[PDB]
Amino acid sequence: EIPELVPVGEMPRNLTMTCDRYLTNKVIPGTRVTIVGIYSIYNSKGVAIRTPYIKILGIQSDVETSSIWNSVTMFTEEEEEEFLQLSRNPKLYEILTNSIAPSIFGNEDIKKAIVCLLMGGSKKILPDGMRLRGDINVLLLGDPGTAKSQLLKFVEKVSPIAVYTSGKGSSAAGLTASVQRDPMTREFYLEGGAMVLADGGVVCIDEFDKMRDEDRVAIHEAMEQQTISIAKAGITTVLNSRTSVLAAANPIYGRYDDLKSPGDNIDFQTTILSRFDMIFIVKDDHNEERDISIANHVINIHTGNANAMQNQQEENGSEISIEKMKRYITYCRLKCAPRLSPQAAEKLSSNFVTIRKQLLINELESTERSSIPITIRQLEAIIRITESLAKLELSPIAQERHVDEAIRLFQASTMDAASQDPTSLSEIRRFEQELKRRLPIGWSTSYQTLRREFVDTHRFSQLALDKALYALEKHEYRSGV
Amino acid sequence: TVYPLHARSTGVAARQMLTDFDIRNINKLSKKKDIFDILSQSLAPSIYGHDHIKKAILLMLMGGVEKNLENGSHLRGDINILMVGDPSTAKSQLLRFVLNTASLAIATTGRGSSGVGLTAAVTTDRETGERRLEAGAMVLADRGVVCIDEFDKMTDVDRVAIHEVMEQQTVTIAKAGIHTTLNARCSVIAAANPVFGQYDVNRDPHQNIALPDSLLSRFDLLFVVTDDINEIRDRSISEHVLRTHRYLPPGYLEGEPVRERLNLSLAVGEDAD
Amino acid sequence: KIYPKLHQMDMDKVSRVYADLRRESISTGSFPITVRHLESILRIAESFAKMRLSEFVSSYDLDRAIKVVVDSFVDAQKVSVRRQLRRSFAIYTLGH
Amino acid sequence: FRKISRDRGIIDKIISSMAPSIYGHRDIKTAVACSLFGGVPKNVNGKHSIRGDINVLLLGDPGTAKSQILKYVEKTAHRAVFATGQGASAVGLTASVRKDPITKEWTLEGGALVLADKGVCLIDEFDKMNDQDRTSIHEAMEQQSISISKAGIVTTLQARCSIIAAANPNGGRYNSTLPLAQNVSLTEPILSR
Amino acid sequence: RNENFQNSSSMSITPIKNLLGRDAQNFLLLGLLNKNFKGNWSLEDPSGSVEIDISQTIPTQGHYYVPGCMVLVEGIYYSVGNKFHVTSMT
Ligand SMILES: Nc1ncnc2c1ncn2[C@@H]1O[C@H](COP(=O)(O)OP(=O)(O)OP(O)(O)=S)[C@@H](O)[C@H]1O
Ligand SMILES: Nc1ncnc2c1ncn2[C@@H]1O[C@H](COP(=O)(O)OP(=O)(O)O)[C@@H](O)[C@H]1O
Ligand SMILES: Nc1ncnc2c1ncn2[C@@H]1O[C@H](COP(=O)(O)OP(=O)(O)O)[C@@H](O)[C@H]1O
Ligand SMILES: [Mg+2]
Ligand SMILES: [Mg+2]
Ligand SMILES: [Mg+2]
């Protein structure tokens, strides 16, 4: 009964219906429908009371959403033509970027990553028994109260192919698919869990950190295989899991704690991080001027008089009817699948091994192995490039490598904020302090001392002096004036 | 009439056909010593390196002779290999490749299955009306190659159950009212991650994996996969992935969406053959 | 029936408020200040205006809301910094 | 009410009005009264929304009328609920499903926070109650709605309730020199929300 | 264009990034010569920069050579040594 009606304190009553051959199977459960059918009564087998039901003469969708898209273009050639025109115009990429997460005040590269993930990485089926894994799951780490859960909810509202959930709200057993005993069959049947629903959909879930870890281990395997293999209770069913999971974990003590050891920071096991293949950070912005500007934005969206003008400003140019954004996203993920690396090949042949070499650089800065967390990051990154080029789709069209380079840079520094040390930046800060404790008082000045000690620092230069300057640079005519 | 076709991707119901042409083929290579290495290379063509690992999995695939004795003691010819590897070491895909390569291919993960369910469920069935035997994997395991992933995560009761039942290759199933003993001889591959994210040499291997040596000794091969990275080998892996990625699947339009269709196989029954 | 509306508001007053909120969480006795805290201040202003019962929010009633929230924050601090912070916010307190 | 509204000093009278039987506590009275009035709900683009309800965090020494303050609060905001804190749990307060042998299927059990929805939510003894339940409450309050997917029940219930948590300082006495987080035995994220 | 003229083309330059992937292999390079802050002579291109081993290096006698100039060079890189052991410098 009418989820909007919300009868206060009344359990929602349900009535049975019947459909005819040209009415049956039109709509799925969990979808609202405006019905026109005769009120109907029959005896279930309590005096003179009989089962109330409805015999339907017409079916209309209250949700109004079209049925399972069988590629029949209700948008027709016209709407998809302007969709391609938006793909033709590279500026529309930033339009979609800005439009996502209204009132967020920035985080544009984050929104770009979100758009790319929602866009769907292409699953390639090799002639071998293997098959390239298309979808990816993005990890959300950072300080609380930073619209992260808000952004997750917004994204899920944008794309209903999956369902927003929360860790505690989702049953710990069978998160992907729970096993339940049917009332009329004592056998525990397989009930579709969230990632069954999330399969074929980009899914956002809350409170990853708050969730018990043990079953979250069962999630990484399912997303890795893109299926869900169950042999529990003597039932060997395997169900596909084509989903893009958006994490929600405030790493430790709420805040991101970037200036602390990643093991302390990331309560999740680093194997889970690698298997989910994505990494991301929300840090403390500071920037009191930017904080002022954020306050302006938040009040503007908060006060209806101002809210309206930002609403129309976003709508005319950028927010462009979020619903038909979702429609275009469906059409253009249909446009993903045809080809995702025509323009890549030549430039990627260099940049792939390039990023591999920067990963080698990273292990060079992370001598002593910097503990377990940093070792597998190179492997998750090499898989990350392969999946993330498809994630970026070639952009709306044919712009894969030139932006994937920047995105890989963003991820590299993302991990470096946590992979610089096993206290993280605090240890290199201590290193640059125990460096500078001689620089002014001794250690000569003006690179002459660097030309003097260790015989022009040559032995010190390759590793020790590089570690020195990497710590020094942060504390030590184009933008200001 | 019924045509059983349970082979993956609609194959030959896991029943490989045979011709005298094919019979005389291969054999001349079998005389050549390199044939074993060629077969090893053929395995996991999507993966780069791990040649010794590929030889090990090849040896896995071929089935040993179950030596029998005039007593309760019957020697097992099954091949059991345990492997520990870092995440994303392709071993999961490796297990998957063994799966799609094997005929029976009973595979799951440590969290994938319930140990009692896979071994034996002695619950009743309502239609039957009395207590039923329901072996999720065990009865499926016997007479076929089987796999297990992330056995470190596997329920410890299942671990102790598999212990000595994979050594004796038979399960008594004397639990509850039913006491019939059913044989469970099969070849099993184990792929469990280290307790630490990656195997640390400073840590002991049994420090790196908490799985006890109980039946861990009863693995015909033991393997450690470490994702250490070297410029030459890193370039090798990268180039392999580059070849695998830009490669359009066989035929099809270059700008064509993935089909993975039903294949509309008209041939059914002896037509399918 | 009463639904006060923020039709009139003091943008930059709230701006300087959140600015002062910053570089205080650095104190060991100070909890972090976030955006949801600012939204809290806004909803406290709404609650005050509903308490005033006018269908339109009053700027000075919103000012008392600011005062209440900032006083709560100051009380949340360690007493050692609390005095310095109260002197700092005194430029805001008198306006109430 | 209109006539008193145009009368000035109404706000101070209301502050004096809330829990008069608790002498003093002028700031506390102000806070609880304005929570009773509650903020204006805000929604953006239909989907993006801002809660109109106020979550009051209270730290009180034992015997400081906190439960009685809550009792005065209730019966004043009509729709009201009481959370014993320790008595309720993650399932009990937020959203509960009950297996129903008479009907033979799993059935929804009234989540006390759903009872909180549409009205004021009283919370007591919260600083002593279970932490996993606390995280469940965090989740529920973040969206002003409780989403539950278990036992075949995937329902989600709106939870619009102004909540007021009751807490005792570490040892029952707050140390002003001590930082609040050290004076608080609970998590940082909850005080943030 | 000149390498197309030399041979459809003569030996081709190898992206600095593609260099270090193999140690003992010889390659053709084109990049800007400058002093590396390590102290070695570095050849730099948009893809990156490589320190150049000035030893075992024969200049082309027809041209001057000063820092801050482009150059076509042939040699081994020695990824372990990380300095391009250029043989002929043109
Ligand atoms: N940069 C921002 N721009 C706009 N609003 C923001 C920003 N950061 C935080 N907010 C607001 O602060 C609220 C707090 O975020 P929530 O939606 O509660 O979830 P969250 O940010 O993940 O918080 P946690 O970590 O779950 S306690 C958001 O809903 C936004 O309204
Ligand atoms: N040597 C390799 N060659 C090719 N791909 C590899 C190699 N090692 C790992 N991978 C890739 O790593 C990804 C994850 O492998 P997976 O089977 O999940 O790892 P694990 O061995 O830890 O179980 C796959 O896409 C796989 O192709
Ligand atoms: N300012 C006050 N005026 C009147 N009664 C008060 C005041 N402060 C505390 N009390 C009394 O303290 C008693 C204890 O209240 P309660 O909330 O149950 O205590 P606790 O602090 O242990 O939770 C109440 O009966 C209340 O009347
Ligand atoms: Mg959250
Ligand atoms: Mg694996
Ligand atoms: Mg009390």
PDB file of C-alpha atoms in Angstrom, chain B residues 13-225:
ATOM      1  CA  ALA B  13      28.906 -33.707 -21.891  1.00  0.00           C
ATOM      2  CA  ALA B  14      32.456 -33.974 -20.503  1.00  0.00           C
ATOM      3  CA  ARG B  15      32.852 -37.010 -22.794  1.00  0.00           C
ATOM      4  CA  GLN B  16      35.759 -36.349 -25.141  1.00  0.00           C
ATOM      5  CA  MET B  17      35.325 -38.001 -28.523  1.00  0.00           C
ATOM      6  CA  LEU B  18      38.001 -40.212 -30.049  1.00  0.00           C
ATOM      7  CA  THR B  19      39.195 -40.987 -33.569  1.00  0.00           C
ATOM      8  CA  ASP B  20      42.060 -43.139 -34.790  1.00  0.00           C
ATOM      9  CA  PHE B  21      43.360 -40.030 -36.555  1.00  0.00           C
ATOM     10  CA  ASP B  22      43.486 -38.218 -33.222  1.00  0.00           C
ATOM     11  CA  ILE B  23      44.814 -41.423 -31.645  1.00  0.00           C
ATOM     12  CA  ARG B  24      47.839 -41.580 -33.936  1.00  0.00           C
ATOM     13  CA  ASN B  25      48.246 -37.831 -33.519  1.00  0.00           C
ATOM     14  CA  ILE B  26      50.040 -36.446 -30.440  1.00  0.00           C
ATOM     15  CA  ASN B  27      51.764 -39.799 -29.959  1.00  0.00           C
ATOM     16  CA  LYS B  28      54.701 -38.972 -32.230  1.00  0.00           C
ATOM     17  CA  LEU B  29      55.195 -35.867 -30.095  1.00  0.00           C
ATOM     18  CA  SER B  30      54.950 -37.997 -26.947  1.00  0.00           C
ATOM     19  CA  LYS B  31      58.085 -39.753 -28.168  1.00  0.00           C
ATOM     20  CA  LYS B  32      59.741 -36.333 -28.271  1.00  0.00           C
ATOM     21  CA  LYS B  33      60.817 -35.208 -24.807  1.00  0.00           C
ATOM     22  CA  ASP B  34      59.631 -31.618 -25.295  1.00  0.00           C
ATOM     23  CA  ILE B  35      55.953 -32.629 -25.523  1.00  0.00           C
ATOM     24  CA  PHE B  36      55.544 -32.301 -21.750  1.00  0.00           C
ATOM     25  CA  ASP B  37      56.872 -28.745 -21.827  1.00  0.00           C
ATOM     26  CA  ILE B  38      54.678 -27.939 -24.836  1.00  0.00           C
ATOM     27  CA  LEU B  39      51.629 -29.110 -22.894  1.00  0.00           C
ATOM     28  CA  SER B  40      52.786 -27.032 -19.931  1.00  0.00           C
ATOM     29  CA  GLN B  41      53.025 -23.955 -22.165  1.00  0.00           C
ATOM     30  CA  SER B  42      49.572 -24.632 -23.609  1.00  0.00           C
ATOM     31  CA  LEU B  43      48.057 -24.439 -20.130  1.00  0.00           C
ATOM     32  CA  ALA B  44      46.995 -20.966 -18.980  1.00  0.00           C
ATOM     33  CA  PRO B  45      48.051 -19.256 -22.227  1.00  0.00           C
ATOM     34  CA  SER B  46      46.531 -16.078 -20.806  1.00  0.00           C
ATOM     35  CA  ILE B  47      49.052 -16.130 -17.928  1.00  0.00           C
ATOM     36  CA  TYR B  48      52.703 -15.191 -18.245  1.00  0.00           C
ATOM     37  CA  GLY B  49      55.409 -17.250 -16.605  1.00  0.00           C
ATOM     38  CA  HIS B  50      54.854 -19.872 -13.909  1.00  0.00           C
ATOM     39  CA  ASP B  51      56.221 -22.578 -16.205  1.00  0.00           C
ATOM     40  CA  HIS B  52      57.020 -24.880 -13.290  1.00  0.00           C
ATOM     41  CA  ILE B  53      53.582 -24.082 -11.882  1.00  0.00           C
ATOM     42  CA  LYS B  54      52.054 -24.989 -15.244  1.00  0.00           C
ATOM     43  CA  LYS B  55      53.991 -28.262 -15.239  1.00  0.00           C
ATOM     44  CA  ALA B  56      52.663 -28.940 -11.745  1.00  0.00           C
ATOM     45  CA  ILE B  57      49.068 -28.287 -12.799  1.00  0.00           C
ATOM     46  CA  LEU B  58      49.587 -30.468 -15.872  1.00  0.00           C
ATOM     47  CA  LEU B  59      50.747 -33.252 -13.569  1.00  0.00           C
ATOM     48  CA  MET B  60      47.634 -32.512 -11.513  1.00  0.00           C
ATOM     49  CA  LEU B  61      45.390 -32.946 -14.538  1.00  0.00           C
ATOM     50  CA  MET B  62      46.707 -36.395 -15.391  1.00  0.00           C
ATOM     51  CA  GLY B  63      45.288 -38.980 -13.001  1.00  0.00           C
ATOM     52  CA  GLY B  64      47.420 -41.472 -11.124  1.00  0.00           C
ATOM     53  CA  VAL B  65      46.658 -45.146 -10.622  1.00  0.00           C
ATOM     54  CA  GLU B  66      44.672 -46.060  -7.505  1.00  0.00           C
ATOM     55  CA  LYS B  67      46.716 -48.998  -6.247  1.00  0.00           C
ATOM     56  CA  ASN B  68      44.490 -51.591  -4.587  1.00  0.00           C
ATOM     57  CA  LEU B  69      45.345 -54.170  -1.938  1.00  0.00           C
ATOM     58  CA  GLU B  70      43.528 -57.256  -0.642  1.00  0.00           C
ATOM     59  CA  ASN B  71      42.482 -55.462   2.537  1.00  0.00           C
ATOM     60  CA  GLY B  72      40.938 -52.227   3.774  1.00  0.00           C
ATOM     61  CA  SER B  73      44.203 -50.481   2.885  1.00  0.00           C
ATOM     62  CA  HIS B  74      43.878 -49.146  -0.664  1.00  0.00           C
ATOM     63  CA  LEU B  75      46.609 -46.887  -2.001  1.00  0.00           C
ATOM     64  CA  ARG B  76      45.435 -43.600  -3.497  1.00  0.00           C
ATOM     65  CA  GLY B  77      46.505 -42.439  -6.939  1.00  0.00           C
ATOM     66  CA  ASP B  78      44.918 -39.027  -6.453  1.00  0.00           C
ATOM     67  CA  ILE B  79      47.021 -35.886  -6.847  1.00  0.00           C
ATOM     68  CA  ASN B  80      46.660 -33.218  -4.161  1.00  0.00           C
ATOM     69  CA  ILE B  81      48.530 -29.921  -4.386  1.00  0.00           C
ATOM     70  CA  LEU B  82      48.417 -26.985  -1.997  1.00  0.00           C
ATOM     71  CA  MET B  83      49.442 -23.517  -3.137  1.00  0.00           C
ATOM     72  CA  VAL B  84      49.740 -20.208  -1.288  1.00  0.00           C
ATOM     73  CA  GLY B  85      49.781 -17.011  -3.310  1.00  0.00           C
ATOM     74  CA  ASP B  86      49.455 -13.235  -2.986  1.00  0.00           C
ATOM     75  CA  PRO B  87      46.067 -11.709  -4.016  1.00  0.00           C
ATOM     76  CA  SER B  88      45.582 -11.213  -7.800  1.00  0.00           C
ATOM     77  CA  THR B  89      48.394 -13.727  -8.541  1.00  0.00           C
ATOM     78  CA  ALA B  90      46.034 -15.189 -11.220  1.00  0.00           C
ATOM     79  CA  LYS B  91      45.949 -18.397  -9.080  1.00  0.00           C
ATOM     80  CA  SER B  92      42.205 -17.781  -8.648  1.00  0.00           C
ATOM     81  CA  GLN B  93      41.992 -17.655 -12.473  1.00  0.00           C
ATOM     82  CA  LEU B  94      44.456 -20.591 -12.391  1.00  0.00           C
ATOM     83  CA  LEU B  95      41.978 -22.518 -10.260  1.00  0.00           C
ATOM     84  CA  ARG B  96      39.353 -21.333 -12.745  1.00  0.00           C
ATOM     85  CA  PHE B  97      41.495 -22.574 -15.630  1.00  0.00           C
ATOM     86  CA  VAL B  98      41.847 -25.942 -13.918  1.00  0.00           C
ATOM     87  CA  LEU B  99      38.066 -25.896 -13.502  1.00  0.00           C
ATOM     88  CA  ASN B 100      37.277 -25.178 -17.141  1.00  0.00           C
ATOM     89  CA  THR B 101      39.994 -27.681 -18.050  1.00  0.00           C
ATOM     90  CA  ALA B 102      38.867 -30.505 -15.771  1.00  0.00           C
ATOM     91  CA  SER B 103      35.772 -32.579 -16.483  1.00  0.00           C
ATOM     92  CA  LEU B 104      34.144 -32.627 -13.040  1.00  0.00           C
ATOM     93  CA  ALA B 105      35.907 -29.533 -11.661  1.00  0.00           C
ATOM     94  CA  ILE B 106      34.443 -29.207  -8.172  1.00  0.00           C
ATOM     95  CA  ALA B 107      35.670 -25.782  -7.057  1.00  0.00           C
ATOM     96  CA  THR B 108      34.773 -23.174  -4.440  1.00  0.00           C
ATOM     97  CA  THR B 109      36.396 -20.815  -1.949  1.00  0.00           C
ATOM     98  CA  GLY B 110      36.905 -20.901   1.801  1.00  0.00           C
ATOM     99  CA  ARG B 111      33.863 -18.701   2.323  1.00  0.00           C
ATOM    100  CA  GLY B 112      32.180 -20.029  -0.819  1.00  0.00           C
ATOM    101  CA  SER B 113      30.747 -23.207   0.674  1.00  0.00           C
ATOM    102  CA  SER B 114      29.575 -24.670   3.960  1.00  0.00           C
ATOM    103  CA  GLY B 115      31.910 -27.490   4.933  1.00  0.00           C
ATOM    104  CA  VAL B 116      29.180 -29.815   6.166  1.00  0.00           C
ATOM    105  CA  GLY B 117      27.023 -28.969   3.159  1.00  0.00           C
ATOM    106  CA  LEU B 118      29.793 -29.683   0.668  1.00  0.00           C
ATOM    107  CA  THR B 119      30.888 -32.823   2.516  1.00  0.00           C
ATOM    108  CA  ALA B 120      27.505 -34.276   3.505  1.00  0.00           C
ATOM    109  CA  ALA B 121      24.120 -32.932   4.621  1.00  0.00           C
ATOM    110  CA  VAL B 122      22.196 -35.573   6.559  1.00  0.00           C
ATOM    111  CA  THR B 123      18.960 -33.571   6.719  1.00  0.00           C
ATOM    112  CA  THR B 124      15.671 -35.063   5.582  1.00  0.00           C
ATOM    113  CA  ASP B 125      13.771 -34.115   2.436  1.00  0.00           C
ATOM    114  CA  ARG B 126      10.044 -33.466   2.781  1.00  0.00           C
ATOM    115  CA  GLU B 127       9.022 -35.193  -0.458  1.00  0.00           C
ATOM    116  CA  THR B 128      11.166 -38.207   0.435  1.00  0.00           C
ATOM    117  CA  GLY B 129       9.768 -38.100   3.969  1.00  0.00           C
ATOM    118  CA  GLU B 130      12.868 -39.364   5.781  1.00  0.00           C
ATOM    119  CA  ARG B 131      16.512 -38.577   6.429  1.00  0.00           C
ATOM    120  CA  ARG B 132      18.519 -37.847   3.280  1.00  0.00           C
ATOM    121  CA  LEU B 133      22.189 -37.774   2.314  1.00  0.00           C
ATOM    122  CA  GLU B 134      23.212 -34.534   0.595  1.00  0.00           C
ATOM    123  CA  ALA B 135      26.924 -34.244  -0.224  1.00  0.00           C
ATOM    124  CA  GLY B 136      27.381 -30.839  -1.814  1.00  0.00           C
ATOM    125  CA  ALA B 137      30.916 -31.384  -3.100  1.00  0.00           C
ATOM    126  CA  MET B 138      32.197 -34.685  -1.673  1.00  0.00           C
ATOM    127  CA  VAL B 139      30.062 -37.025  -3.771  1.00  0.00           C
ATOM    128  CA  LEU B 140      30.624 -34.614  -6.649  1.00  0.00           C
ATOM    129  CA  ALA B 141      34.326 -34.623  -5.783  1.00  0.00           C
ATOM    130  CA  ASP B 142      34.987 -38.345  -6.162  1.00  0.00           C
ATOM    131  CA  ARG B 143      35.989 -39.572  -9.630  1.00  0.00           C
ATOM    132  CA  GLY B 144      36.956 -36.083 -10.763  1.00  0.00           C
ATOM    133  CA  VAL B 145      39.435 -33.283 -10.323  1.00  0.00           C
ATOM    134  CA  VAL B 146      38.310 -30.800  -7.678  1.00  0.00           C
ATOM    135  CA  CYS B 147      39.500 -27.391  -6.496  1.00  0.00           C
ATOM    136  CA  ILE B 148      39.420 -25.237  -3.373  1.00  0.00           C
ATOM    137  CA  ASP B 149      40.354 -21.579  -2.952  1.00  0.00           C
ATOM    138  CA  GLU B 150      41.175 -19.513   0.137  1.00  0.00           C
ATOM    139  CA  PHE B 151      41.227 -22.605   2.332  1.00  0.00           C
ATOM    140  CA  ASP B 152      42.655 -20.443   5.116  1.00  0.00           C
ATOM    141  CA  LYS B 153      39.242 -18.773   5.278  1.00  0.00           C
ATOM    142  CA  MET B 154      37.532 -22.177   5.177  1.00  0.00           C
ATOM    143  CA  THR B 155      35.592 -23.226   8.267  1.00  0.00           C
ATOM    144  CA  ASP B 156      37.933 -25.085  10.596  1.00  0.00           C
ATOM    145  CA  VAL B 157      35.416 -27.901  11.098  1.00  0.00           C
ATOM    146  CA  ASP B 158      35.460 -28.433   7.338  1.00  0.00           C
ATOM    147  CA  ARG B 159      39.257 -28.314   7.438  1.00  0.00           C
ATOM    148  CA  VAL B 160      39.493 -31.054  10.062  1.00  0.00           C
ATOM    149  CA  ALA B 161      36.819 -33.002   8.179  1.00  0.00           C
ATOM    150  CA  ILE B 162      38.736 -32.849   4.885  1.00  0.00           C
ATOM    151  CA  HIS B 163      41.755 -33.847   6.952  1.00  0.00           C
ATOM    152  CA  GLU B 164      42.303 -37.616   6.718  1.00  0.00           C
ATOM    153  CA  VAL B 165      39.255 -38.049   4.498  1.00  0.00           C
ATOM    154  CA  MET B 166      41.385 -36.754   1.660  1.00  0.00           C
ATOM    155  CA  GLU B 167      44.198 -38.908   3.017  1.00  0.00           C
ATOM    156  CA  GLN B 168      41.998 -42.016   3.090  1.00  0.00           C
ATOM    157  CA  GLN B 169      39.930 -40.718   0.143  1.00  0.00           C
ATOM    158  CA  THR B 170      36.776 -42.068   1.828  1.00  0.00           C
ATOM    159  CA  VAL B 171      34.186 -40.615   4.212  1.00  0.00           C
ATOM    160  CA  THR B 172      32.279 -42.798   6.667  1.00  0.00           C
ATOM    161  CA  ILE B 173      29.204 -40.506   6.730  1.00  0.00           C
ATOM    162  CA  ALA B 174      28.279 -42.334   9.933  1.00  0.00           C
ATOM    163  CA  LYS B 175      26.931 -39.032  11.274  1.00  0.00           C
ATOM    164  CA  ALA B 176      23.342 -39.055  12.557  1.00  0.00           C
ATOM    165  CA  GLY B 177      21.093 -42.014  11.786  1.00  0.00           C
ATOM    166  CA  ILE B 178      22.673 -42.811   8.424  1.00  0.00           C
ATOM    167  CA  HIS B 179      25.959 -44.702   8.694  1.00  0.00           C
ATOM    168  CA  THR B 180      26.684 -45.669   5.077  1.00  0.00           C
ATOM    169  CA  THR B 181      30.303 -45.025   4.084  1.00  0.00           C
ATOM    170  CA  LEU B 182      30.868 -43.462   0.662  1.00  0.00           C
ATOM    171  CA  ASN B 183      34.219 -43.143  -1.090  1.00  0.00           C
ATOM    172  CA  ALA B 184      35.573 -39.664  -1.835  1.00  0.00           C
ATOM    173  CA  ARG B 185      38.722 -40.216  -3.902  1.00  0.00           C
ATOM    174  CA  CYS B 186      39.572 -37.205  -6.065  1.00  0.00           C
ATOM    175  CA  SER B 187      42.346 -34.783  -6.983  1.00  0.00           C
ATOM    176  CA  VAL B 188      42.258 -31.475  -5.103  1.00  0.00           C
ATOM    177  CA  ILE B 189      44.123 -28.193  -5.588  1.00  0.00           C
ATOM    178  CA  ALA B 190      44.367 -25.775  -2.664  1.00  0.00           C
ATOM    179  CA  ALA B 191      44.854 -22.025  -3.143  1.00  0.00           C
ATOM    180  CA  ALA B 192      44.821 -20.190   0.194  1.00  0.00           C
ATOM    181  CA  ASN B 193      46.201 -16.709   0.763  1.00  0.00           C
ATOM    182  CA  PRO B 194      48.884 -16.207   3.421  1.00  0.00           C
ATOM    183  CA  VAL B 195      47.827 -14.992   6.852  1.00  0.00           C
ATOM    184  CA  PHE B 196      49.815 -11.883   6.048  1.00  0.00           C
ATOM    185  CA  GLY B 197      48.827 -10.191   2.816  1.00  0.00           C
ATOM    186  CA  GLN B 198      51.965 -11.516   1.135  1.00  0.00           C
ATOM    187  CA  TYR B 199      54.276 -14.333   2.149  1.00  0.00           C
ATOM    188  CA  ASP B 200      57.114 -12.866   4.197  1.00  0.00           C
ATOM    189  CA  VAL B 201      60.275 -14.968   4.214  1.00  0.00           C
ATOM    190  CA  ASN B 202      61.158 -13.556   7.637  1.00  0.00           C
ATOM    191  CA  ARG B 203      57.920 -15.073   8.890  1.00  0.00           C
ATOM    192  CA  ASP B 204      57.810 -18.846   8.837  1.00  0.00           C
ATOM    193  CA  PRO B 205      55.657 -20.416   6.106  1.00  0.00           C
ATOM    194  CA  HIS B 206      53.477 -21.802   8.892  1.00  0.00           C
ATOM    195  CA  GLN B 207      53.623 -18.313  10.343  1.00  0.00           C
ATOM    196  CA  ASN B 208      52.645 -17.051   6.891  1.00  0.00           C
ATOM    197  CA  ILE B 209      49.777 -19.577   6.699  1.00  0.00           C
ATOM    198  CA  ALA B 210      47.932 -20.688   9.829  1.00  0.00           C
ATOM    199  CA  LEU B 211      46.717 -23.935   8.260  1.00  0.00           C
ATOM    200  CA  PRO B 212      48.190 -26.773  10.354  1.00  0.00           C
ATOM    201  CA  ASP B 213      50.473 -29.372   8.830  1.00  0.00           C
ATOM    202  CA  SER B 214      47.652 -31.860   9.484  1.00  0.00           C
ATOM    203  CA  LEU B 215      46.870 -33.103   5.942  1.00  0.00           C
ATOM    204  CA  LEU B 216      48.992 -30.180   4.795  1.00  0.00           C
ATOM    205  CA  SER B 217      51.736 -32.775   4.671  1.00  0.00           C
ATOM    206  CA  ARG B 218      49.172 -34.806   2.720  1.00  0.00           C
ATOM    207  CA  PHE B 219      49.511 -32.574  -0.327  1.00  0.00           C
ATOM    208  CA  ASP B 220      51.389 -34.278  -3.141  1.00  0.00           C
ATOM    209  CA  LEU B 221      52.816 -30.863  -4.026  1.00  0.00           C
ATOM    210  CA  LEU B 222      53.218 -27.631  -2.079  1.00  0.00           C
ATOM    211  CA  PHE B 223      53.509 -24.267  -3.800  1.00  0.00           C
ATOM    212  CA  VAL B 224      54.283 -20.709  -2.727  1.00  0.00           C
ATOM    213  CA  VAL B 225      53.349 -17.844  -5.039  1.00  0.00           C
TER     214      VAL B 225
END
